[PDB]
Amino acid sequence: IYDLHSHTTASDGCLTPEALVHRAVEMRVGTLAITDHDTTAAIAPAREEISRSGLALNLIPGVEISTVWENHEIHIVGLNIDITHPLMCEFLAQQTERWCTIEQAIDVIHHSGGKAVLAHPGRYNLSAKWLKRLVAHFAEHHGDAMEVAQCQQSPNERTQLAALARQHHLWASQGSDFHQPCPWIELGRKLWLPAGVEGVWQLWEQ
Ligand SMILES: [Mn+2]
Ligand SMILES: [Mn+2]
Ligand SMILES: [Mn+2]
């Protein structure tokens, strides 16, 4: 199971990086991305806990970047980024100082060696036509993937998003957006991709 969107006490999650990696293994998550808001501070302690505890969990370094597009707050997740790259650190420092554009987020992620993901597209409450414009804009500026699967989701939304991703030659991501234990969100829960779209992890696995 891949869960490529989660938070820790480094941003607005309630669990430490150490508690989260253990929760992921208990939930039978095989690959976990930590994607804290505008910080990578949880990655190094999470890796340390996986090693010290002998966990069989692949940690994907990630971040969730806050952007603005056409006056809408839009979140872009970077996956498999190099968290020590000076441009990434500078960019995140500018983010916590203050937003930036979608294209600017994508460029920093790519320069850091990662893949850019349009996060939770259904949450922006856009009409079908404006969601299409957002996705077309994201793809036009070299975005790589879009989150297709979430924990709380009608089957219709998931297949609509997968078709929208495929339409623009984007890969699909999946993530719980876990912040704290609660009824409606759990690490790995109900995350799978429908047929007709490939997972974003292909872009670094091969
Ligand atoms: Mn959050
Ligand atoms: Mn978000
Ligand atoms: Mn999030």
Author numbering: 9 to 106, 177 to 284
What did the study's authors say about this model?
To gain insight into how an exoribonuclease could function as a deFADding enzyme, we attempted to determine the crystal structure of E. coli RNase AM in complex with FAD in an effort to elucidate the mechanism for RNase AM monophosphate hydrolysis and deFADding activities. However, no crystals were obtained for RNase AM alone or in the presence of FAD. No density for the RNase AM insertion domain was observed, indicating that the domain is disordered in this crystal. The final structure consists of residues 9–106 and 177–284 and is modeled with three manganese ions (Mnα, Mnβ, and Mnγ) and a sulfate molecule in the active site. The refined atomic model contained no RNA and has excellent agreement with the X-ray diffraction data and the expected bond lengths, bond angles and other geometric parameters. RNase AM has a distorted (β/α)7-barrel fold and a three metal enzyme active site composed of histidines and aspartates/glutamate residues. Mnα and Mnβ, which are proposed to coordinate the water for nucleophilic attack are coordinated by residues His13, Glu72 and Asp255, and Glu72, His83 and His198 respectively. Mnγ is coordinated by residues Asp20, His45 and His257. The sulfate molecule coordinates all three metals and forms a salt bridge with Arg201, which may stabilize the hydrolysis reaction intermediate. Comparison to the CV1693 product complex containing AMP and Pi shows that RNase AM has the same overall fold and active site architecture, and the RNase AM sulfate is in the same position as the phosphate product.
